[PDB]
């Protein structure tokens, strides 16, 4: 009866961490793509002005 | 000439908003201390959780033996 | 000068990136305590039934 | 012994599954942070260029 008892520990526990860390898994998953919202427009912003500094360089030519 | 002007402007904002960077980093350091205390609490809580596991083990043995009795 | 432009960037790179990191780990560390904290007393509360079921049997 | 058997399922249900999601999670945690630092190099690079924008700018103003 010790056997049934003592071995009852992890199964409840491991599920808990299964219940615990998986929730974190999808939780910290979308965390990555959340940044992707900030990345793309910035990527445009980088693209928006990287070409324009030479355009500024080109405006600098108007000198 | 242009070095003089562009610099002067450069040192000015570099100074003030660099100190700004220092200050914002300082609040970030306060957050760091919070996170570290959170961390050490996490390990100590986990150790208490383990000790709870063995203690409940012991409770189970002192349940079972007296059941036998 | 530009070196401090390098340096202010160096801080800008340092401070913001460590800023980009410190809370993100802290936030994990932020959410961390409660789940431990809950199971800190969750096991404790179920530890009562381990103590609860014990006593009467020993009386018996 | 049925329980001694029916306990075994979960201990392999969980551990393997908990042997599953973990190595992903830090691996997932590793990649995006590897991603994110790259973001700061270029995102800020826009600013320092725009810092050089004013350079040509106050050059575009003086002289």
Author numbering:
A (entry chain G), D (entry chain H): 154 to 216
B (entry chain N): 288 to 356
C (entry chain M): 297 to 356
List sentences from the manuscript.
Crescentin is a coiled coil protein that is required for the crescent cell shape of bacteria such as Caulobacter crescentus. Crescentin shares biochemical and cytoskeletal properties with intermediate filament (IF) proteins, which form the third major class of cytoskeletal proteins in eukaryotes. To better understand the relationship between crescentin and IF proteins, and the filaments they form, we have determined the three-dimensional structure of crescentin filaments by cryo-EM. This revealed the full-length structure of the parallel coiled coil dimer of crescentin and how dimers come together laterally and longitudinally, to form a non-polar, octameric filament.
Cryo-EM analysis revealed that for both versions of CreS, purified CreS-MB13 complex at pH 8 polymerizes into regular, unbundled filaments upon lowering the pH to 6.5 in the presence of detergents, such as CHAPS. We next extended the box size to ~960 Å (referred to as “large box”) for the visualization of a more complete CreS structure, which included regions that are distant from the NB13 binding site, which was mapped to a segment near the C terminus of CreS. In the presence of MB13, CreSwt, and CreSsat similarly assemble into a “supertwist”-like filament, where two intertwined strands, I and II, are related by a two-fold axis perpendicular to the filament axis. When looking at the map down this twofold axis, each strand consists of four partial CreS dimers (dimers A, B, C, and D for strand I, and symmetry-related dimers A’, B’, C’, and D’ for strand II) within a viewing window of ~960-Å wide along the filament. Assembly of a nearly complete CreS dimer (residues 31–446 for CreSsat or 31–443 for CreSwt) was possible through symmetry expansion, based on the observed partial dimers A and B, resulting in an atomic model of the strand. The resulting atomic models of CreSsat and NB13 allowed for interpretation of CreSwt maps, determined at lower resolutions (4.36 Å to 5.78 Å). The structures of the WT and SAT versions are very similar, except that the SAT version is slightly longer because the helices contain one almost complete extra helical turn.
